[PDB]
Amino acid sequence: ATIKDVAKRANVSTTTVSHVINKTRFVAEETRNAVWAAIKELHYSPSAVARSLKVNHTKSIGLLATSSEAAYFAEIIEAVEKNCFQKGYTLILGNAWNNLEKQRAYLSMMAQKRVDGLLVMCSEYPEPLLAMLEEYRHIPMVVMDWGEAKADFTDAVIDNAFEGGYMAGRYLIERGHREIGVIPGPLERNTGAGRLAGFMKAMEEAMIKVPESWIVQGDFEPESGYRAMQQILSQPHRPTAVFCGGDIMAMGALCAADEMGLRVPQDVSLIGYDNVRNARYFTPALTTIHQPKDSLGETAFNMLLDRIVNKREEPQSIEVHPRLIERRSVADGPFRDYR
Amino acid sequence: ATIKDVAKRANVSTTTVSHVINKTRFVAEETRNAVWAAIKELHYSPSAVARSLKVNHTKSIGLLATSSEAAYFAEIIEAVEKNCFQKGYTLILGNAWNNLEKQRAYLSMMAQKRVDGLLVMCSEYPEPLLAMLEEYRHIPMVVMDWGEAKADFTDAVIDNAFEGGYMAGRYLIERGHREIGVIPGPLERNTGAGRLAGFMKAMEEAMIKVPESWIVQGDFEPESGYRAMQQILSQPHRPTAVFCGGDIMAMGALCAADEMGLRVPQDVSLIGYDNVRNARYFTPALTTIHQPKDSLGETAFNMLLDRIVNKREEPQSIEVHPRLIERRSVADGPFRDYR
DNA sequence: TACGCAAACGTTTGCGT
DNA sequence: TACGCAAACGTTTGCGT
Ligand code: HPA
Ligand code: HPA
Numbered sequence: 001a002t003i004k005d006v007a008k009r010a011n012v013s014t015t016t017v018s019h020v021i022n023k024t025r026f027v028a029e030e031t032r033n034a035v036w037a038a039i040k041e042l043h044y045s046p047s048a049v050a051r052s053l054k055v056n057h058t059k060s061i062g063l064l065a066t067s068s069e070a071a072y073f074a075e076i077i078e079a080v081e082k083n084c085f086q087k088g089y090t091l092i093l094g095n096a097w098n099n100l101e102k103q104r105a106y107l108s109m110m111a112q113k114r115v116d117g118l119l120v121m122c123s124e125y126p127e128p129l130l131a132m133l134e135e136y137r138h139i140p141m142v143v144m145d146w147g148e149a150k151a152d153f154t155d156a157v158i159d160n161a162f163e164g165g166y167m168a169g170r171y172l173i174e175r176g177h178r179e180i181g182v183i184p185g186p187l188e189r190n191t192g193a194g195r196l197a198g199f200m201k202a203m204e205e206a207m208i209k210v211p212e213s214w215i216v217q218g219d220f221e222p223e224s225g226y227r228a229m230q231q232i233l234s235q236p237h238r239p240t241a242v243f244c245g246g247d248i249m250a251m252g253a254l255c256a257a258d259e260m261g262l263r264v265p266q267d268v269s270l271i272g273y274d275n276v277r278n279a280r281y282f283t284p285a286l287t288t289i290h291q292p293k294d295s296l297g298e299t300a301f302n303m304l305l306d307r308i309v310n311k312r313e314e315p316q317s318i319e320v321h322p323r324l325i326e327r328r329s330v331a332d333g334p335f336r337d338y339r
Numbered sequence: 340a341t342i343k344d345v346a347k348r349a350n351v352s353t354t355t356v357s358h359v360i361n362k363t364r365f366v367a368e369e370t371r372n373a374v375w376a377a378i379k380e381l382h383y384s385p386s387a388v389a390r391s392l393k394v395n396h397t398k399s400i401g402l403l404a405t406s407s408e409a410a411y412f413a414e415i416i417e418a419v420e421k422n423c424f425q426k427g428y429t430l431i432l433g434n435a436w437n438n439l440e441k442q443r444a445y446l447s448m449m450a451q452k453r454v455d456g457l458l459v460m461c462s463e464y465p466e467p468l469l470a471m472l473e474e475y476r477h478i479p480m481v482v483m484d485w486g487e488a489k490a491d492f493t494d495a496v497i498d499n500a501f502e503g504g505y506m507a508g509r510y511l512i513e514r515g516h517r518e519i520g521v522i523p524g525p526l527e528r529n530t531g532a533g534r535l536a537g538f539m540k541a542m543e544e545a546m547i548k549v550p551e552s553w554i555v556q557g558d559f560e561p562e563s564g565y566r567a568m569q570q571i572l573s574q575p576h577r578p579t580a581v582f583c584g585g586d587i588m589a590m591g592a593l594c595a596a597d598e599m600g601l602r603v604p605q606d607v608s609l610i611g612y613d614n615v616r617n618a619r620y621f622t623p624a625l626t627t628i629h630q631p632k633d634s635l636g637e638t639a640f641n642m643l644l645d646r647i648v649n650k651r652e653e654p655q656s657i658e659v660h661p662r663l664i665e666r667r668s669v670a671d672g673p674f675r676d677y678r
Numbered sequence: 679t680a681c682g683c684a685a686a687c688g689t690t691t692g693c694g695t
Numbered sequence: 696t697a698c699g700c701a702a703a704c705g706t707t708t709g710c711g712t
Contacts, residue, residue: 003705014705015681022707027681050706053392053686053687053705068407068416068417081433082434090431091433093432113429114386251621278590281591281594354699354701364698365696370697393688
């Protein structure tokens with residue numbers, strides 16, 4: 001039950017039991033064995049609580065997420081978790097659903113549980129949230145979802161969402177389109193506003209004007225893709241191509257088109273963004289901008305461990321890069337031959 | 340920094356600080372305030388480690404999962420998490436990927452971290468795993484993925500996967516089909532073998548014989564749905580309808596059909612299972628058996644808390660029930676008018 | 679050579695007066 | 696009335712001899 005119970009069965013001091021258990025000093029074989037034996041019948045399981053109390057670190061990390069079911073998110077989380085495990089850390093998952101109160105709560109429970117570091121993925125960063133976060137500059141942390149380093153008291157991994165938005169637009173332009181519409185994600189997020197603007201730069205470069213009736217705000221959820229695609233194609237004049245800010249929303253856009261009798265890409269070309277695991281099996285196989293979700297995770301974890309173990313003080317930031325994945329949802333547009 | 344530092348700034352004993360902080364006894368207003376004030380400048384955050392060491396419970400639960408990205412899983416996890424939070428518990432997520440070693444590791448780290456209870460979702464339960472689990476009968480636990488109560492030392496929530504398999508088959512039969520094929524999930528799992536057998540009972544009842552070339556094993560992953568659908572339709576004689584053991588695999592089956600030029604449901608009818616959040620937005624909107632994922636989570640959490648707080652000793656088991664969701668992937672079969 | 683003493687980590691709580 | 700003493704929870708680790 002307790003180290004004391006073990007030391008006693010083994011007839012050695014607890015100081016000894018602890019040394020064999022942690023190979024922190026040489027112990028006579030025979031001695032070791034005895035301890036192991038006792039450890040065994042006693043069915044001892046050392047208390048990490050006790051230990052952490054003395055050693056001052058819990059070997060545990062907290063993820064302050066937005067939600068965890070959304071494919072995008074879910075893929076990152078599973079990555080972060082992979083890393084913790086292989087480096088002996090334990091993951092504490094907390095979804096704040098973009099709720100300040102919730103954020104304030106989890107943040108606290110976390111601090112109380114004395115997590116060695118914090119991985120932050122809150123989507124939106126209002127001042128109040130930015131404020132609560134600084135109050136914990138003491139806990140080592142890294143934000144994995146900004147496009148620029150919003151603050152000095154944290155590490156940051158940046159996705160170059162603007163560059164990707166730009167890649168998306170260029171591709172459409174290079175395929176022959178000039179009448180393009182867009183369904184962006186929330187402008188309050190990096191993956192929302194960022195991708196959009198990247199996209200819009202390329203349009204401007206090509207002197208392509210995007211009429212406002214062709215821009216419909218989504219929320220990364222499929223229903224939102226569904227309604228937007230519908231509002232776009234449900235009009236007199238419709239674009240020949242659509243840039244959809246997120247794969248899952250795109251999936252929604254695909255379904256509406258089909259329900260309206262439109263053909264993809266024969267009638268409308270569709271390009272998404274994220275390259276979630278199932279994008280290839282959408283119907284038709286989705287052409288999209290890939291976000292390195294795995295590296296985003298691993299890179300974030302690593303910066304954390306650094307700050308952790310190597311007691312780093314300076315905020316760091318590391319970029320990651322998106323890349324176009326051609327599938328079958330895009331077709332040449334009316335101006336292809338003219339380039 | 341420490342309770343001691345607070346008691347001192349406040350000029351009261353720590354016994355006092357602790358009482359205000361936990362409202363465990365009456366404290367003079369003025370006294371309270373002082374403590375709060377100190378608590379404030381000191382920027383104190385009570386140590387849960389310390390506390391748990393004394394009180395003997397961590398207010399934290401461990402989820403020994405298989406993986407967390409798969410839509411099915413991801414939806415359950417997000418539910419379990421919702422429950423922990425509203426009941427003040429902290430969630431420790433651990434994916435064992437159906438690996439014994441991994442299982443043995445997480446199980447241990449968990450025990451060491453002294454989690455108040457364990458939510459188990461390992462998919463497959465080989466004796467060796469069944470064995471490791473009993474070694475921890477001491478920690479309160481519930482398995483959320485068996486179809487029958489595999490053991491006495493745990494609580495269990497059962498999904499009635501056989502009943503659902505049977506619902507799926509019946510529907511096809513009632514729609515006019517007699518040439519049906521099936522892509523089941525791994526037979527080593529409840530959601531695999533269970534659904535299949537439910538399905539097969541209905542066939543037998545209808546004297547429908549399922550030729551072996553029409554049964555293709557999947558693994559819940561879309562690629563597997565893709566290959567299987569392909570092997571099924573890639574043959575001389577093909578069924579008019581397909582029962583697909585999991586939505587995500589179904590999504591794969593949908594894509595292959597389209598790629599082979601087949602029409603759903605015009606050429607082939609397809610019925611899935613799970614009713615994952617995006618099934619409605621598949622193309623076409625997927626007809627499937629719904630698994631109450633939310634209730635599965637909440638129900639499991641609740642049984643745990645019970646055993647926890649009410650120190651229950653007896654293994655319990657609670658059933659949950661699936662229900663058919665008609666969408667647009669099924670059409671009447673050749674024998675409809677003949678019934 | 680190989681191991682043990684005892685203090686400390688940060689809290690909570692029975693008995694007090 | 697309203698608060699404090701001090702022991703304990705389960706470990707780790709400096710100094711020993
Ligand atoms: O905020 C988001 N939510 C879901 N999917 C996403 N893909 C990019 N950003 C997001
Ligand atoms: O084991 C499974 N994996 C993924 N999805 C599933 N849906 C039912 N069972 C499963």
